[PDB]
Design a protein around this ligand. Sequence first.
Ligand SMILES: Cc1c2c(c(O)c3c(O)cccc13)C(=O)[C@]1(O)C(=O)C(C(N)=O)=C(O)[C@@H](N(C)C)[C@@H]1C2
Ligand SMILES: Cc1c2c(c(O)c3c(O)cccc13)C(=O)[C@]1(O)C(=O)C(C(N)=O)=C(O)[C@@H](N(C)C)[C@@H]1C2
Ligand SMILES: [Cl-]
Ligand SMILES: [Cl-]
Ligand SMILES: [Cl-]
Ligand SMILES: [Cl-]
Ligand SMILES: [Cl-]
Ligand SMILES: [Cl-]
Ligand SMILES: [Cl-]
Ligand SMILES: [Cl-]
Ligand SMILES: [Mg+2]
Ligand SMILES: [Mg+2]
Lengths: 207, 207
Amino acid sequence: SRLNRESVIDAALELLNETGIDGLTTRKLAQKLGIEQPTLYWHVKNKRALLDALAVEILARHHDYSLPAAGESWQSFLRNNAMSFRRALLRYRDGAKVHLGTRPDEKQYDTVETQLRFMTENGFSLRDGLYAISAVSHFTLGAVLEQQEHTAALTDRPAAPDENLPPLLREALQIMDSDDGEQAFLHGLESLIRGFEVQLTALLQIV
Amino acid sequence: SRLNRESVIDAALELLNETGIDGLTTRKLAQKLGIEQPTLYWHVKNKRALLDALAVEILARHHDYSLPAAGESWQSFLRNNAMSFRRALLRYRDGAKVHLGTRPDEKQYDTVETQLRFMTENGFSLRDGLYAISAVSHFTLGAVLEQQEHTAALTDRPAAPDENLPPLLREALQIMDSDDGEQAFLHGLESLIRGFEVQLTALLQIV
Ligand SMILES: Cc1c2c(c(O)c3c(O)cccc13)C(=O)[C@]1(O)C(=O)C(C(N)=O)=C(O)[C@@H](N(C)C)[C@@H]1C2
Ligand SMILES: Cc1c2c(c(O)c3c(O)cccc13)C(=O)[C@]1(O)C(=O)C(C(N)=O)=C(O)[C@@H](N(C)C)[C@@H]1C2
Ligand SMILES: [Cl-]
Ligand SMILES: [Cl-]
Ligand SMILES: [Cl-]
Ligand SMILES: [Cl-]
Ligand SMILES: [Cl-]
Ligand SMILES: [Cl-]
Ligand SMILES: [Cl-]
Ligand SMILES: [Cl-]
Ligand SMILES: [Mg+2]
Ligand SMILES: [Mg+2]
């Protein structure tokens, strides 16, 4: 089939969503694309180049709150941005894994620059605005990775018996699987945002 | 070589640290252990069972602040615990990946129960104490995964040219690679802990 960048990425995303990050092999991508391996290598050099492109395209497709609205508070922007990032990551199996360790792509420069500027315009030093943005990113990636991997593990083997659990852990387990992770994520997200606020408003006051 | 559980895990950890989570294959573990594959399968059924055991043992070896000190504040306990968790995860290549989606093991029940109880004794509802503990865990796992994957990506291919970067992003990149991620992690960690505190102390007050 077509091997423009768009369609290679399309197929890799499909493959990703079907078989997870382990399924993204040269061989399996070539088979999905209906091609021989040397054909694929002309287009895609290695798994890393593919993973980097997927990380970019997952956000291009499904990360729909990447810039602050007019007059938006930094708090509200981090909240909306985090929700959007999470949704984009959850779209595809192992999409959080695919993002890990990437650095913004040239295609994302204007966006991330605007994010960083926006933070600074709201009183954060570049460093502290970056640490806030990093923390939101890290938290969200962790939350998503734990949710997606847990679902994958369920499919492999069952949890161990309930009746040997201590009681708080037993409740906690009910709670965690009472949903897909959203409630815990949103609660943690508010904690994070408020802690950034405490740090910021403190200025040079001990806090 | 020896194929008690301890030594299987030892070898898998070595292999993990040498070749990362992709290197943990039946075949490569059997080769490290000096055995044929059917010998290994007697001991280790599948990659998941192995990954689960590694997640447990990485914390048994190197997670040395799992319980609160006498009279310790919940804040200080989450801080020390998070630092320790991070250190344990960073010990082995892809050790954060190995943890993802796991649930506490029977061997960890008394510890995690104590953690949950401790939170509740400090005024958190079980749910809110769990959300705090989850958030700390998620943040730490994200931070560690991004640090370790970034190091792995460096080895594969170089970052793109500096001179097309916008300036805040260029600075931010200097900052992020000014260290291994510790400074950003510690800063984010304080934000998280303080946000939990704001949430807790608020009681039924709008906050
Ligand atoms: C500013 C920044 C960001 C990201 C990032 O990885 C990063 C970096 O690795 C070094 C220095 C700066 C940044 C994000 O991944 C990203 O997810 C992202 O690319 C991004 C985006 N492209 O829209 C975001 O929305 C941001 N957000 C989840 C907090 C965050 C922004
Ligand atoms: C309480 C709890 C925890 C963990 C966890 O995964 C979990 C769960 O998946 C469901 C319900 C409860 C928990 C941790 O992984 C763990 O890392 C952990 O096992 C753990 C430990 N075994 O010592 C910790 O130190 C904890 N910490 C990093 C906040 C955290 C505690
Ligand atoms: Cl083509
Ligand atoms: Cl294209
Ligand atoms: Cl607003
Ligand atoms: Cl503010
Ligand atoms: Cl033996
Ligand atoms: Cl043993
Ligand atoms: Cl204390
Ligand atoms: Cl308190
Ligand atoms: Mg990123
Ligand atoms: Mg865990």
